[model samples]
Target: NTTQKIIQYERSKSDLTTQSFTLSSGDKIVYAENGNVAGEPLLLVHGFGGNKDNFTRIARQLENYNLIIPDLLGFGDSSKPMAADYHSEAQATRLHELLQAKGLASSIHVGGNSMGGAISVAYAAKYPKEVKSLWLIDSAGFWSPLLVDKKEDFYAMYDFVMSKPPYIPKSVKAVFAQERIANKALESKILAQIVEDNVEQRAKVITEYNIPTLVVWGEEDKVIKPETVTLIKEIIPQSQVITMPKIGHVPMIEAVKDTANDYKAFREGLK
Candidate 1:
């Protein structure tokens, strides 16, 4: 009771319904749902090293839409099967399965930030008929060769993807590096399997498939280069791009009001 009472202080802020969504492959997805019951359906996906709470700062801004935010398998509270593919294509397939099971119809909005954004791109492409619009926020695709190391060094991969490296010393980074090397080694696997080709192809899908897309970015993002915004728009000429000045990697956290308004504007513009 004391522990619950102590934790409730932090818990009181969130109103999202917590629940489990069992995937077709038997993996249980832990998710949070908020917003209006009768509102338009929206699937908000989180980035790498993030969970449902990543959107806490801007969740209220999305209240006009029915939002379902899930922890992608292998991250957060979702079950990470030892044999799971753990790639964007695999992630997209699992989400498609979840949506089909939930009985959603032809069109639903899927917005993803960072790694989730890349997954969203793959999902929309893989199931163009199901996804109505695509929103990419500081997404991880469009990898620049200089930015990523496609090698087996998990620690280097970790530091590269993270906007801010851990505060620990080099000795600690070395220890955790193997913790990564021994197990799933998510970073290394992602680098090797989920290469720039996937990102490049997803950009093409937006144009060829004619998906209404929105590209949102943190101008100061150190993870994925801001030049990607230009690249995304150039690839998908009809897509809209907006940048949050001075905000890094995650815009929803650094500038909630603006990030929320951007979502509102994007949704409003959509058919």
Candidate 2:
């Protein structure tokens, strides 16, 4: 009864409407859709440990298009299967298949932040014609820029990922933690296969396929070395890169107007 009440509470407080798809692969995928479904469709994928809500702040700024945010398997409200492949390539394929099944056949602009940005690269690589352009904000995959001039090195970030708390009450934290605890094996698989050094190798998709891309980063982001800008530029010489000062990893949140404005300018140029 207590668990049921908590579930009910979560459902009640969610402002975004969610729908689930039982993929033909037998995996249950969950996603949230918001703002102008009849307008142009835009897929906004989230990063690791982040759910669809991560885009809510930015989504409010770009009101002209429909936003589809999904929590990739092993993350957020999505179902986690310990045995499922978490490789970025496979993840992109799963999302593509899911979108196709839902009748989104037209070329759509795909925007992703962080890990999702990496997935966007793979998606564009695999189906170049299906994607109009890619908006990759502070993406992670390529050999990232090393943290420079700061005392903290690349490895210091593990501290936050391993121990940062959401500051919620004990009860709420426990419920979320319990679910995450069960996904440890899934997380391990993802880290071993998709993150770290593997990202440098997986990032080949950017050069493999030539698609117009917009790259945005925060100048002060210690999380993903700001210098990653150079690596991405080297890989895709045509990509337009935007850097926001005084912001961290999440430019969409920290510097909303600048991020959205840069995106608007880039999107317009695509024509």
Candidate 3:
């Protein structure tokens, strides 16, 4: 699969200017920024067990637009205090603070995959005026059950997400394993938080705000159930839903070019 050679196609750190920010909570977040600061700002969020680098490929594709990709507190290079709240709301709060700190708090496009999508939902629901539009790919906010119980569960989770198994090098696999091990407790907490926030009621809240939402789903998604799209559409009837066939859960990683193009079309439709 192309995902096995994802490293070859992924955007390098040099392409994205990585920077650090210390939030009001005293926790620091590492993010990648590029494009015109005064242009339209897009707060791109990554999923559970993923980092800001998850958006790196799409960032390269959408480099002309302003992008703020951050490593959620418990993932990537961000500070992962063991006792900190890693729930969707808590994570969204930090992102809100980060955007406000950067002076991009007003009128922004917010989007994410999986748990990040869940956080984006919470963000838009809590601050409706700040979000001009919402983009969700395989969103887990409506119904997710991705809690890991053991070390092996990490790999199992990966297997569950992809339509087929990934065949990466052992060294690279080890690095991901080590990262997960280092933040196991926080990951578990966040997973629990995801499940707790997975009720349809939480997602229905967005409908009241009438935020323009774009819901993209992988036809082969197994981790969060592609069938959940029906529920999402039911909750937010005005949302635009796109289902990509042959793609798995993370379309941004599995189908970079198509995902970027589809996202561009979505943005163009808004204007």
Query: Each candidate: what lDDT?
Result: 0.71, 0.70, 0.80
Pitting candidate 1 against candidate 2, the one with the higher TM-score is 1
Per-residue accuracy of model 3 over 128-159 as CA lDDT, tens digit each: 87888999999877852444535644576776
Q: How far off is residue 184 in model 2, in Å?
A: 3.2
**lDDT tens string, model 2, 198-245?**
455544565566678888987777677779989988878888888877
Can you write out model 1's per-residue Cα lDDT over 135-245, one digit (the tens) per residue? Answer: 899887775533332334634544344443324345544433443344445555555555543576766877888989889987778787888988788878988899877
Q: After superposition, how far is residue 216 of candidate 1 from its true place, in Å?
A: 1.0
Off by over 4 Å in 1: 1-14, 144-192, 195-197
TM-score of each: 0.80, 0.79, 0.88
Residue 220 of candidate 3: its Cα lDDT? 91
Q: In candidate 2, which residue pairs get closer than 3 Å at backbone N, Cα or C atoms, i.e. clash?
A: none
Q: How many backbone clashes can be found in candidate 3?
A: 0
lDDT of 3: 0.80
